[PDB]
Subunit: 76 residues, 2 copies
Amino acid sequence: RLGSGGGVCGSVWGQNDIAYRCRTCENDPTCAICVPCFQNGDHNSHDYSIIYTGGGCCDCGDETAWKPDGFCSNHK
Amino acid sequence: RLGSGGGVCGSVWGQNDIAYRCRTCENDPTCAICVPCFQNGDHNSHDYSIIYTGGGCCDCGDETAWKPDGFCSNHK
Ligand SMILES: [Zn+2]
Ligand SMILES: [Zn+2]
Ligand SMILES: [Zn+2]
Ligand SMILES: [Zn+2]
Ligand SMILES: [Zn+2]
Ligand SMILES: [Zn+2]
């Protein structure tokens, strides 16, 4: 998808991987971030969930997919 | 974003790149495909447009972003 450039997390998911959904930081229901990005950010009382994904990429740092307050440390 | 795996086009866009939007094959307004995927597929009377993108990735082959009839040859 289009999205922003700059300091976004490359990470890509293969067929038996884990990501995190966060209904609080997300722009739409298919946004997700990789495990390190979630744990290196602050989501304490957000409505997050674990997801076993078979594909996609981490939305961390891309403000067209993820609220910037939900970025982890290494992505602004 | 989440999306599908398998035979999807990796391609990623940097800060002065070209992609194609196709309002006909797209699932939502931010979907886009890279130049080779567009030209190796069939979009003759679709409502496509050129876009100078600064970021994102090609949606070709990912049926959660792009109608499969709009895939190019090398992605099913
Ligand atoms: Zn990440
Ligand atoms: Zn991150
Ligand atoms: Zn969150
Ligand atoms: Zn492509
Ligand atoms: Zn393609
Ligand atoms: Zn098309």
